[PDB]
Amino acid sequence: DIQMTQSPSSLSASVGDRVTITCRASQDISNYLNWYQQKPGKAPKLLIYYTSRLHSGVPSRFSGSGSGTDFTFTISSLQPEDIATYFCQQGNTRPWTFGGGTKVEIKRTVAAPSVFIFPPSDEQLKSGTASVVCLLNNFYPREAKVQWKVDNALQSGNSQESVTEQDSKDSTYSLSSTLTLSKADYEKHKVYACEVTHQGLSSPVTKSFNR
């Protein structure tokens, strides 16, 4: 089989910067080399085919070059909507094979998160469980520290985080931290707080409520 090696596996650049991704085929594939863009949860989209031909709906900031085994994919000026994983693929000899992909990320200025806390609903409590949610909205960089406090006492092991993919418009991230407790443990305490530590914050931010 023809092995496709992509470089780098991931990269970060600012809006307006030139982005270069390469692909090497283990054998000569002439010019039967295609590039796809895949946004998370979405199907790959054909951007370039036959090394340099742009597919329909593709702006000319995307270009491709190469011959033989070595190929280059270029974004002349990186835009916020370009956050995606890019794959090369040879269509010369079966089995058709893909490169491992290159994740393209955006570097931007530090942005502080807006923090929100949500108590469990009455509906959920009636089921025997309590979820407490802390939201960190539109921040940069990705790195953030969320600490749970139950009656001014630090919590561990009973929380899970989820981070969105970098925003297609402003390139920020959002994070949710969910604290799972039994209804019994939740009904025992009064003060529920999430303390957020982030680069964009002058001091750790605490959002709280009384049950």
Binding site: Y50, R94, P119
Partner: protein, 217 residues
């Protein structure tokens, strides 16, 4: 326009078989090759095989030849892929993709993918709870949402106000809880209006669960 529409997500027991479909529209079905591509966690994109719908001729990737059986039905413009002796390693998103016309040896149109989960766990619909906006901080921006808890397998979709509200919407990637069930929240930052109504629309296709939840202050 050219469209490839795939069958819904499913959980299948180890040892079982699943037949995934790809309905093509907007072009002459027999004129283009249909490819099947796997996207398994940590394996990237892998070509499984292809079919020439006109003659029903397949070409398999040798890696998938024992596992996959690809067919096409010209009368219904549908391509199929049947996966045999399902194992945990077969949990993946499966795509169908059309090979362009002669000169365009590329996959120009793709289906939306079918998430096949191989597990002994039963399908389970989510419980949907409101994430009510706090009665405090009213600089103008407030947050509200929906907690979509304890469902299996992936995926779940969330829309707001039947698709009318998109700005400020953040639907978090699902987290696999220790229980083996997924959970996620879908949030929205609003300019402390409420006055406006907010309804999250939850659809979990594997369990055919549809829930509309009103998030009130």
């Amino acid at each position: 326009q050219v469209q490839l529409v795939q069958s819904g997500a499913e959980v299948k027991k180890p040892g079982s078989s699943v037949k995934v479909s790809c309905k093509a529209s907007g072009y002459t079905f027999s004129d283009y090759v249909i490819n099947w591509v796997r996207q398994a966690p940590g394996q990237g994109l892998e070509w499984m095989g292809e079919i020439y719908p006109g003659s029903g001729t397949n070409y398999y990737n040798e890696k998938f030849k024992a596992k996959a059986t690809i067919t096409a039905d010209k009368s219904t413009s549908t391509a199929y892929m049947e996966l045999s002796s399902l194992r945990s390693e077969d949990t993946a998103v499966y795509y169908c993709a059309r090979r362009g016309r002669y000169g365009l040896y590329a996959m120009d149109y793709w289906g939306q993918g079918t998430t096949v989960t191989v597990s002994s766990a039963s399908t389970k619909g989510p419980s949907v709870f409101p994430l009510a906006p706090s009665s405090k901080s009213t600089g103008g921006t407030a947050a509200l949402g929906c907690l979509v808890k304890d469902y299996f397998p992936e995926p779940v979709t969330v829309s707001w106000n039947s698709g009318a509200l998109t700005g400020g919407v953040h639907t978090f990637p699902a987290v696999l809880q220790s229980s083996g069930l997924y959970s996620l929240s879908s949030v929205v930052t609003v300019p402390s209006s409420s006055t406006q109504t907010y309804i999250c629309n939850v659809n979990h296709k594997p369990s055919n669960t549809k829930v509309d939840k009103r998030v009130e202050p």
